[PDB]
Amino acid sequence: AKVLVLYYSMYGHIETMARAVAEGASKVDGAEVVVKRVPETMPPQLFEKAGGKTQTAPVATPQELADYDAIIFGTPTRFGNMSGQMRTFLDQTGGLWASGALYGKLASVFSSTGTGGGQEQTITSTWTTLAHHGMVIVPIGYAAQEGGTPYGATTIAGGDGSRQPSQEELSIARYQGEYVAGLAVKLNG
Amino acid sequence: AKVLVLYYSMYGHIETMARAVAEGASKVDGAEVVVKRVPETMPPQLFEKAGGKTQTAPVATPQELADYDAIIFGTPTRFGNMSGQMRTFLDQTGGLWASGALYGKLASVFSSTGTGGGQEQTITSTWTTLAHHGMVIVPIGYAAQGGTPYGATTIAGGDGSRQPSQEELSIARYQGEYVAGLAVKLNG
Amino acid sequence: AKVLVLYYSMYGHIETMARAVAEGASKVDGAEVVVKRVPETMPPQLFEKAGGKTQTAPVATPQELADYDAIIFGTPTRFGNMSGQMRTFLDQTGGLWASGALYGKLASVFSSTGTGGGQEQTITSTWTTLAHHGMVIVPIGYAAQGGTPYGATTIAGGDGSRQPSQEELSIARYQGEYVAGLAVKLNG
Amino acid sequence: AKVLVLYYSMYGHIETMARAVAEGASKVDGAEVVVKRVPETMPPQLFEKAGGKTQTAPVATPQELADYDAIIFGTPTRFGNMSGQMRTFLDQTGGLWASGALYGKLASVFSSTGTGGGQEQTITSTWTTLAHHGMVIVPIGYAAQEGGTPYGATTIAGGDGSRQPSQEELSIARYQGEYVAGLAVKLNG
Numbered sequence: 001a002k003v004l005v006l007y008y009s010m011y012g013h014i015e016t017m018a019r020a021v022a023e024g025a026s027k028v029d030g031a032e033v034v035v036k037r038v039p040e041t042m043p044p045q046l047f048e049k050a051g052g053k054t055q056t057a058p059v060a061t062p063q064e065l066a067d068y069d070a071i072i073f074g075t076p077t078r079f080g081n082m083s084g085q086m087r088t089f090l091d092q093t094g095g096l097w098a099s100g101a102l103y104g105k106l107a108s109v110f111s112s113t114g115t116g117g118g119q120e121q122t123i124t125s126t127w128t129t130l131a132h133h134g135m136v137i138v139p140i141g142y143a144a145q146e147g148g149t150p151y152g153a154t155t156i157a158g159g160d161g162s163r164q165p166s167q168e169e170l171s172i173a174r175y176q177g178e179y180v181a182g183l184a185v186k187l188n189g
Numbered sequence: 190a191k192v193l194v195l196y197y198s199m200y201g202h203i204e205t206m207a208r209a210v211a212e213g214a215s216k217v218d219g220a221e222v223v224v225k226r227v228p229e230t231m232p233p234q235l236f237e238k239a240g241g242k243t244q245t246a247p248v249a250t251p252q253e254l255a256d257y258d259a260i261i262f263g264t265p266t267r268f269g270n271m272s273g274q275m276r277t278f279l280d281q282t283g284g285l286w287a288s289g290a291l292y293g294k295l296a297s298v299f300s301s302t303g304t305g306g307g308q309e310q311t312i313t314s315t316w317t318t319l320a321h322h323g324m325v326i327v328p329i330g331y332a333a334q335g336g337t338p339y340g341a342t343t344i345a346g347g348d349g350s351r352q353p354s355q356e357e358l359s360i361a362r363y364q365g366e367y368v369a370g371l372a373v374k375l376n377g
Numbered sequence: 378a379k380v381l382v383l384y385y386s387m388y389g390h391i392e393t394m395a396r397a398v399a400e401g402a403s404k405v406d407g408a409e410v411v412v413k414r415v416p417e418t419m420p421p422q423l424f425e426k427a428g429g430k431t432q433t434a435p436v437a438t439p440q441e442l443a444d445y446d447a448i449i450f451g452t453p454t455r456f457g458n459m460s461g462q463m464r465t466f467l468d469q470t471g472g473l474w475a476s477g478a479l480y481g482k483l484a485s486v487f488s489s490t491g492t493g494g495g496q497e498q499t500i501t502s503t504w505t506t507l508a509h510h511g512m513v514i515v516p517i518g519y520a521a522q523g524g525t526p527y528g529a530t531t532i533a534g535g536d537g538s539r540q541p542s543q544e545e546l547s548i549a550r551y552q553g554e555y556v557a558g559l560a561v562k563l564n565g
Numbered sequence: 566a567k568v569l570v571l572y573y574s575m576y577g578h579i580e581t582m583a584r585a586v587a588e589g590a591s592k593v594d595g596a597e598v599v600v601k602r603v604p605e606t607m608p609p610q611l612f613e614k615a616g617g618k619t620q621t622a623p624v625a626t627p628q629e630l631a632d633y634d635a636i637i638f639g640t641p642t643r644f645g646n647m648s649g650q651m652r653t654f655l656d657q658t659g660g661l662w663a664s665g666a667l668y669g670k671l672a673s674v675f676s677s678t679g680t681g682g683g684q685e686q687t688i689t690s691t692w693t694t695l696a697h698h699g700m701v702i703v704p705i706g707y708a709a710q711e712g713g714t715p716y717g718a719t720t721i722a723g724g725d726g727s728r729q730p731s732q733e734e735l736s737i738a739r740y741q742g743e744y745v746a747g748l749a750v751k752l753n754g
C-alpha cells in the first residue's frame with residue numbers, strides 16, 4: 001500500500017509531526033511511505049521576514065494524489081480551519097473529484113495550534129473536503145488515553161511558537177501513521 | 190462481516206431509508222445484516238397523539254453495538270443535530286467507549302429532513318460521536334448525485350407528506366452496499 | 378433585558394459554571410437574570426446510583442425560552458455533542474420555531490469536558506440548533522486566554538474529581554457579562 | 566454604521582449575490598455600505614482559461630476590516646469549505662486578531678454551490694474563523710420560509726455553472742443584508 005503524508009508547515013511544527021507520522025506508517029510491513037508538502041503561497045521575502053522555517057520536502061502536485069492508497073493530511077490551525085496554503089492546494093483537486101480518483105481511499109488528519117483553540121474544528125472541517133472526494137475517514141479515537149483530540153494527532157506550538165512537540169505527541173502521531181498504513185495494507189495489500 | 194442499521198424514526202421516513210440501507214448491505218456476499226431501532230423516549234400516549242408511526246423493528250440496546258463490524262446510523266434532522274432519542278441512546282455507550290469496544294469498526298450515517306436545511310450538520314455532528322469511539326467513517330461522496338456527499342438523505346416535505354423517492358432510496362441502498370463491501374474486505 | 382442561563386449538569390460542573398455565568402450577567406445594569414435547568418431524563422433511581430448531583434435550580438419548560446432576550450446554554454460534552462437531556466429538551470421547541478419565537482434573540486454556549494477533546498464540537502454543534510431558531514450567536518473569542526474562543530469551558534478530569542478553576546469561572550462570568558451587555562444594548 | 570460586504574467569486578455567482586446583499590443593507594437608514602473582494606490568487610492566464618469572470622470590485626486589504634461595524638462574507642463552496650482565496654485573505658488577519666480589532670463586530674455569511682452539497686459546512690466552517698475574532702454571528706434562520714439554509718443566503722450555480730440566482734435567492738440575500746445592517750445601526754448608530 002502506498003501512503004502519502006501531505007502537509008503544510010510554516011514554522012516547522014507540522015513538519016516535525018509529519019516525520020513522526022511517516023515513521024509510524026513505515027513500521028507497517030507492505031506499506032510504502034512518501035512525505036510531501038503543498039506549495040508555499042507566500043512570496044519568499046514575506047515568508048523570510050515572518051520568520052518562516054524554509055520547507056525542503058518535495059512539493060506535491062494535485063494529480064499525484066491519485067497514486068496513493070491512503071493520504072494523511074497535516075495542517076496547522078488558521079482560526080479553526082486548515083491553512084490557506086492547504087485550502088488553495090485542495091481547491092486544485094477538481095480533476096480528481098470529477099474522475100472519482102480519490103473515492104474510497106483512506107484519509108486522516110493531524111494538526112497544530114498555538115494554544116489549543118480551534119484544533120478540533122481544523123480537523124473536522126478538513127474531513128468535510130475529504131468526504132466530498134469519497135475518502136474513508138480515520139480518526140484516532142481514545143488512542144492517546146490508551147489537551148489532544150480523538151479526531152487526529154495534534155501538537156501545541158505555544159503562544160510564541162517556541163514549544164516543540166513532546167514525546168507523547170510524537171508517539172500519538174506515530175500511532176496515527178502506523179494505524180492508517182495498517183488499514184491501507186489490509187485493504188489494498 | 191456483521192452490519193447493523195441502527196435508526197430512529199418518528200414518522201417513518203428514516204424507517205423507509207433504513208430498510209433500503211439494509212437491502213443494499215444484504216446484496217454483499219459475506220455480509221449479515223440486522224435492522225434495529227433506538228428506544229422511543231416519548232410516552233406512548235404523546236407519540237400516538239403526535240401522529241407518530243409505530244414500528245416493527247426490534248429495539249436495540251446500547252451494549253449490543255459492539256457485536257457488529259459496521260454500524261450505519263439513521264436519524265432525522267432536529268435543527269441540524271441527531272434526534273434526542275438517538276442522542277440519549279448514544280450517551281449510554283460510555284461502557285463501550287471505556288473498553289474500546291467500537292474502535293476501528295466502520296460507521297456511516299443517513300438522515301431525513303423536512304425542507305433540506307440541516308441535513309449536512311446532522312450527519313457531520315453524528316460523525317463527531319462516532320470518531321470519539323474511534324470508528325472509521327464512510328461518507329458516500331459524489332454518489333450523492335440536493336443530496337449530500339456525507340451520507341444518504343431524504344426530503345420529507347414541510348408537512349411531512351412526502352415519502353422517500355426512488356432515487357433517494359437507491360442512494361440509500363448504494364450506501365449499505367458500499368459499507369457492507371468495506372466490512373467484508375476488512376473482516377471477511 | 379432578560380437573560381436566561383439554561384443548563385444541563387449531571388455531576389455539578391456545568392451547574393457551577395452556570396452560576397458564574399449568571400453572576401457575570403447580573404453585573405450588567407439593566408439585566409435581569411434567571412437560572413434554570415433542563416429536565417433530567419434518567420429515572421431518579423439510576424441518577425442516584427450513577428452518583429449524579431441533585432440540583433436546586435427550577436426546571437425550565439421548552440416554551441418559556443421565548444420570554445428572554447438572551448439565552449446562555451450550558452451543556453457537558455457527550456462525545457462532541459450536547460447531552461441527550463439538552464437535545465431532548467430542544468427537540469420540544471418546534472412550537473417556538475414555527476412562530477419565530479426565538480428569532481433575533483442572543484444565544485451563547487458554555488460547556489464542560491472530562492479531558493478536553495470534544496468541547497469545541499459540543500459548542501459549535503449547539504450553535505447549529507440556535508441558528509435554526511434564527512438566534513444571534515455570541516462567541517467569546519480571545520477572552521478564552523486549553524479553552525476555546527467559542528464559549529467558556531471547564532475540565533472535569535477523567536474521573537470527574539476536578540472542579541472548575543478560578544480562571545475558568547472568571548471566563549464564565551466574562552461570558553455572562555458580555556452577553557448581558559449586548560442584550561441591554563439591543564433591548565434596553 | 567458601516568457595513569462591508571466582502572466576497573470572493575470566480576464565475577460571478579457570489580458577485581451577483583454580493584450586490585443583492587449590499588442593496589439590502591443600503592435600505593437601512595444610517596447604514597453605509599461598501600462592497601469589496603479578496604485578491605484572486607490564481608495567475609490571470611489560468612483564471613482566463615478556466616473561464617473565470619473577471620472581478621472588478623476594489624480589492625480589500627486585511628487592515629481595513631477594522632473600519633466596519635459589520636462584515637458580511639461571501640464565498641463559494643470549495644468541497645464544504647470557503648475558497649482558498651478567502652482562506653488566504655483571512656489568514657492575513659493576525660494583526661487584527663492580536664489587537665482585538667474585530668472583537669464584538671457583526672459577522673454573517675452567504676454562499677454558492679454547484680449542486681447543494683457542502684453549502685451548510687461552508688457557512689458554519691466560516692463562522693469558526695469569525696468566532697476566533699470575537700465576532701457576533703448572525704444567521705438568517707427560517708427567513709426564506711417566512712434548498713437553502715438557516716445559516717446564510719445561498720444560490721445554486723448548477724453542475725455546469727450556468728444557473729443564475731433566482732429572484733427568491735436574491736430576495737433572501739437582500740434580507741440578509743438588510744437585517745445585518747439593521748443590527749449594525751441598533752448597536753453602533
Ligand SMILES: Cc1cc2nc3c(=O)[nH]c(=O)nc-3n(C[C@H](O)[C@H](O)[C@H](O)COP(=O)(O)O)c2cc1C
Pocket residue numbers: 008009010011012013014015076077078079080111112113114115116117118119157161655656657658659697
Ligand atoms: C493566521 C493565523 C491564525 C492562527 N489561528 C490560530 C488559532 O485559531 N488557534 C491557535 O491555537 N493558534 C492559531 N495560530 C497559531 C498557528 O496554528 C501555529 O503557528 C501553527 O500551529 C504552527 O504550526 P507550523 O509550525 O507547522 O506552521 C494562528 C496563526 C496564524 C499565523
Ligand SMILES: Cc1cc2nc3c(=O)[nH]c(=O)nc-3n(C[C@H](O)[C@H](O)[C@H](O)COP(=O)(O)O)c2cc1C
Pocket residue numbers: 197198199200201202203204265266267268269300301302303304305306307308345349467468469470471509
Ligand atoms: C424538533 C424538530 C426539529 C426539526 N428540525 C428540522 C430542521 O432543522 N430542518 C428540516 O429540514 N426539518 C426539520 N424537522 C423535520 C424532520 O427532520 C422531519 O420531520 C424528519 O426528517 C422526518 O423523519 P422521520 O419520519 O423518520 O421521523 C424537524 C422536526 C422536529 C420534530
Ligand SMILES: Cc1cc2nc3c(=O)[nH]c(=O)nc-3n(C[C@H](O)[C@H](O)[C@H](O)COP(=O)(O)O)c2cc1C
Pocket residue numbers: 279280281282283321385386387388389390391392453454455456457488489490491492493494495496533537
Ligand atoms: C456519555 C458520556 C460521554 C462523554 N464524552 C466525553 C468526551 O467526549 N470528551 C470528554 O472530554 N469528556 C466526556 N465525558 C465527560 C463529561 O463531559 C463530564 O463528565 C462532564 O463534563 C461533567 O459535567 P457535569 O458535572 O456538569 O455533568 C463524557 C461523559 C459521558 C457520561
Ligand SMILES: Cc1cc2nc3c(=O)[nH]c(=O)nc-3n(C[C@H](O)[C@H](O)[C@H](O)COP(=O)(O)O)c2cc1C
Pocket residue numbers: 090091092093094132573574575576577578579580641642643644645676677678679680681682683684722726
Ligand atoms: C475546487 C472546487 C470545488 C467545488 N466543490 C463543490 C462542492 O463541494 N459542492 C458544490 O455543490 N459545488 C462545488 N463546486 C462548485 C462551486 O461551488 C461553484 O463554482 C461556485 O459556487 C460558483 O460561485 P462563483 O460563481 O461565485 O465562483 C466546486 C468548484 C470547484 C472549482
